[PDB]
Design a binder for this molecule. Structure first.
Ligand SMILES: CNC(=O)c1cccc(CN2[C@H](COc3ccccc3)[C@H](O)[C@@H](O)[C@@H](COc3ccccc3)N(Cc3ccccc3)S2(=O)=O)c1
Lengths: 99, 99
């Protein structure tokens, strides 16, 4: 589909059998979600925003459904202001910017 | 044009006659640029994201050229590490997210 930007590009995602709201964010390199439990081991990672950097937990090969489209990739969990779907997953669902 | 997200969506913008590189950020409500001088009165504001908040100066009705498309809108100026073009301006150039 085509999403306009007059309002926040919020979509429903499914992860760990739960539905959550997330922002389609072309400015983010990675996908970062609010604190939650994911399976497997995690690795440390530092990501930065306008205010500075934060430490998050990196989980790999996580199944996440975005607007019905299934994706499998790296998900970061940490103190993020909102659930963010970044370029690593946007590319998997074939998302592009057009104008 | 159609911009893929394999890499960060960086574009050239023209503001105050100056050329700059900026990130197209669908997750950002507003536009925030690195410290610079702009004519007119401004209002202080606080914007936050990953890492926390930063103080910025809000200028209204600023003319900006993005990829040859003229757009008018509010621009926030502050100690941001990267120039960010948010939704307030992306809408004016008719930018959409598609997949
Ligand atoms: C009202 N606030 C604004 O208009 C407003 C205006 C401008 C900016 C922001 C905040 N940013 C949002 C996220 O914050 C929020 C918070 C609440 C609601 C919406 C977005 C942005 O959309 C993201 O792209 C992330 C990159 O996050 C990641 C995630 C994973 C890996 C790497 C980055 N940042 C922008 C940024 C990009 C590159 C370098 C430095 C900073 S951010 O600063 O963290 C809000």
């Amino acid at each position: 589909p085509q999403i306009t930007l007059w309002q926040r590009p919020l979509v429903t995602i499914k992860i760990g059998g739960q539905l959550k709201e997330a922002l389609l964010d072309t400015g983010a390199d990675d996908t970062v979600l609010e604190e939650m439990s994911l399976p497997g081991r995690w690795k440390p990672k530092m990501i930065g925003g306008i205010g500075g950097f934060i430490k998050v937990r990196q989980y790999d090969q996580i199944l996440i459904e975005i607007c019905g489209h299934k994706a499998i990739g790296t998900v970061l969990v940490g103190p993020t202001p909102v659930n963010i779907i970044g370029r690593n997953l946007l590319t998997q669902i074939g998302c592009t910017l057009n104008f």
